[PDB]
Amino acid sequence: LDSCGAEPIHIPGAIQEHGALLVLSAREFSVVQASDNLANYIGVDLPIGAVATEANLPFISVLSAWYSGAASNFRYAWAEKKLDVSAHRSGTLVILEVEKAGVGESAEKLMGELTSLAKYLNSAPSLEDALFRTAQLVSSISGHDRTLIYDFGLDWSGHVVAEAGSGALPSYLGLRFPAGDIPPQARQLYTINRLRMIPDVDYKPVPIRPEVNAETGAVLDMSFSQLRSVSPVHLEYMRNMGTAASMSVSIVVNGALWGLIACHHATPHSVSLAVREACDFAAQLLSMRIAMEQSSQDASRRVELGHIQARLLKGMAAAAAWVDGLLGGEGEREDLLKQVGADGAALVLGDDYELVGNTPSREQVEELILWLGEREIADVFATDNLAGNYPTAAAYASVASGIIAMRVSELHGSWLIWFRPEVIKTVRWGGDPHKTVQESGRIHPRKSFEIWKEQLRNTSFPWSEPELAAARELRGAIIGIVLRKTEE
Amino acid sequence: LDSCGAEPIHIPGAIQEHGALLVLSAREFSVVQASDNLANYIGVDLPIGAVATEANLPFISVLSAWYSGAASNFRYAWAEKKLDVSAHRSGTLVILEVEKAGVGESAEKLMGELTSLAKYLNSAPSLEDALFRTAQLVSSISGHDRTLIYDFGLDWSGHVVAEAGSGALPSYLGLRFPAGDIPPQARQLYTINRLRMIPDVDYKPVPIRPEVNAETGAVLDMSFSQLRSVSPVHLEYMRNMGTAASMSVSIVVNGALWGLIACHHATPHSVSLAVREACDFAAQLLSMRIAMEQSSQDASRRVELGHIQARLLKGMAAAAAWVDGLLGGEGEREDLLKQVGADGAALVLGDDYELVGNTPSREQVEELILWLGEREIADVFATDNLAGNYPTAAAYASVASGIIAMRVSELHGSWLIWFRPEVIKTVRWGGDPHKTVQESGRIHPRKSFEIWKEQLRNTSFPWSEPELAAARELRGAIIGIVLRKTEE
Ligand SMILES: */C=C/C1=C(C)C(=O)N/C1=C\C1=NC(=C\c2[nH]c(/C=C3\NC(=O)C(C=C)=C3C)c(C)c2CCC(=O)O)/C(CCC(=O)O)=C1C
Ligand SMILES: */C=C/C1=C(C)C(=O)N/C1=C\C1=NC(=C\c2[nH]c(/C=C3\NC(=O)C(C=C)=C3C)c(C)c2CCC(=O)O)/C(CCC(=O)O)=C1C
Ligand SMILES: [Ca+2]
Ligand SMILES: [Ca+2]
Description:
Beta-Lactamase, bilin chromophore, 7-stranded antiparallel β-sheet, surface mutations, signaling protein
């Protein structure tokens, strides 16, 4: 259960103060909803149900032409009001937003800056150098007191891997922050909407009315609203961190959220639409370099584990008993361990326990199998910290802090379990990563982000996605080989 | 009409000599078809209709397990017969192939070689350096007399951009070869099947029988058959080139065929399955570096042309007459030309001709519009060599060798045409690129690939995909703006 993750952040029915929002129906461009501050930004009152005309909205022919083409987002520089206008499509609606235009900016200056970044990335000595250059560029153009790059781990915790700034905020470079600082619905949203900005932590939310959109009969889906009012609890987190403004940018690599470029200010601070879009572009450029590196490594590992797989599957088929493809020689046993980069394995077939390499005792495995028995396992169970959910395991963390466990073969109660040892390491966090407080029925963030150091115990080197896949495929192979052998 | 492009290369009903082929039905693994040389490679006669058993095929339980999992290709090292076995799925069939195994190779040596390439690419000073390193690696592992990298142009002609080898074959580095050397169905096939090998140009094809597959009732689709007998006319091309063996590898970037790693030998030469797969891997690695570079440039250009588009669309909407967004000031006119990187444009609205920048005369444009009038144009007509299909245009190649032409507005006979000048350049081809001979009812390749040099005339700098898109979008915008203005 995750109460943080359950907040419906995409439907707050309000926006921040630095702009206004209008919802139009696609066919007619009839005004279906509006933020309470609309007439202010645009100088004309649009009653609900009324038809936007060119007199109200000088850009409406451009909006019309945009609507029916391919571009996902509308942009229009409304010089007269010094407003930047943006829009997106949602169902049968157009959601239109306006904000103050940038001052003293040009497309041509931003293009030269991004071109230089692209060229630098297109050589790119090293990823580290690519990350620092990208943070420095974003810092230069956004004017924020701090810009960092936040790299997500397999558990959705993250480490600060690059940083630039004015000195007005603390340094978090090299620190880890827990998964729960960005809850899963926020992570999902941030996968599909790559930009956000909070220019003043203490804005007063501006209501969107009417509450119910008459075209849809539901509340407004603000997933792609740039002005969307943000979660109260995140604002509390910002206050606790001492950041009066933020802006972040998703780094999306091969369709998955790789990390964030996160920016903060010690006082209120906004960034123009053109500069936000340039920061997205910068993140995309960086993502291309990251991808080169990520995919080469991943693919190489899959090739490697494929070779080991081919040998195991061949020996399993050639042997009288499939198990001897795993246990029947020194190469077989070495390959068994290498298949997932483990240091040990138990093959448990009914009452026969066969321990290979470095394992817990028979007695420890039997207890572990009883413990596993009581869970639903789709294909494989994997953990890098078995003591975490199975405390009796702390007694054998030196050999089996990490496990991949799975049922195998045609016999219920037969398992293949791979083991990894504890690897102790010192981990420095931005504050106590267990510190969330429950109060008035809600989970609140920690108050301190001061370096919080631990000697991490009972935790193995993490299981990679190629190692998990290889486990799944081995499992599939064992049963398919068996099935076919049985046809005879 | 393209008779070269019409040959059904994926259904020759025969294979090359260096392996054998068996078609199995998926459910039963019943033998549906076989190459005439099968019993030779595998030592057991499989009558058609008969059920493959483990005695015939020791790997059949592995094949069975593979069939029902996710992997696209089967591989099995049949040590006893020193055969490499491969397979793929096609409809309800499995197509299984066997060939001689490699001698004195290891997975671990190939992995170290590819890892070093990946690491080099993951810094990669320059694309040129990446291309040469990749050719050198492929040369090292494949043993071919020559390895080159062949980069496709927008017209599907290609230039040799890297090369390595023994000296036993000529150098083609820096030469261009015409589009018709690889016809469009071959290019399509090579987009989805990234590997091919022809170990001996003078092999005698081995028939697959029966002719009709009884499970499907049609001939065998050999698109993904590695042993497939190849087009006779390509074999003629190889003989003319003096290459007794070849192997090539597609370089696929963002789903499109970017180029080939092409290898040749002056005498017969084969490459093992493991080495072919390593060459595919090498091409994929290279593709990741190419992609970084390609996508950055493309994306930057789209941003740039987007900015110009936003200005044009805004001026078109603000003006009484949409045309003044294009003609109504110095910026408007500059943006009009810049929208597609042109040096000139004609906006022709009924009988009013408005020429901007460097154009042909009114009289020349009027004739051009008559010529255009007689063609079907989906959205835009674009060429980099207008004299090519419109010879009277040679008289104004200095100003309008290249054009993008399109109908615009709500009035039939209204056009926007952008112009580019001739850029003369010296082009060196691998033989006369117009030289194909018709004989006995078929098109044959040239006999000489000796450097063939021309001063290329009547040809502009080529139109890029972002420039074409920008033209299409402008066209869409003009009509949408007009439509909405008209609502009033
Ligand atoms: C019970 C809920 C939450 C706890 C507890 C908590 O700590 N956060 C909780 C919820 C949300 N956080 C949201 C957004 C968000 N969080 C971060 C986190 C970081 N900021 C940093 O500076 C660093 C590290 C140096 C971290 C790890 C960021 C960057 C963001 C995005 C907003 C921004 O750029 O400031 C969030 C969603 C907010 C919204 O979009 O409505 C929730 C619900
Ligand atoms: C009328 C048909 C053809 C003309 C004329 C011609 O010149 N080629 C014709 C047809 C086919 N070519 C096919 C394959 C193919 N072509 C090339 C071309 C090159 N080899 C080179 O060395 C260089 C440049 C240095 C070029 C441009 C290659 C590489 C290939 C792929 C085969 C290989 O690696 O040798 C083809 C299809 C063959 C098949 O797959 O069946 C046809 C029909
Ligand atoms: Ca990561
Ligand atoms: Ca190219």
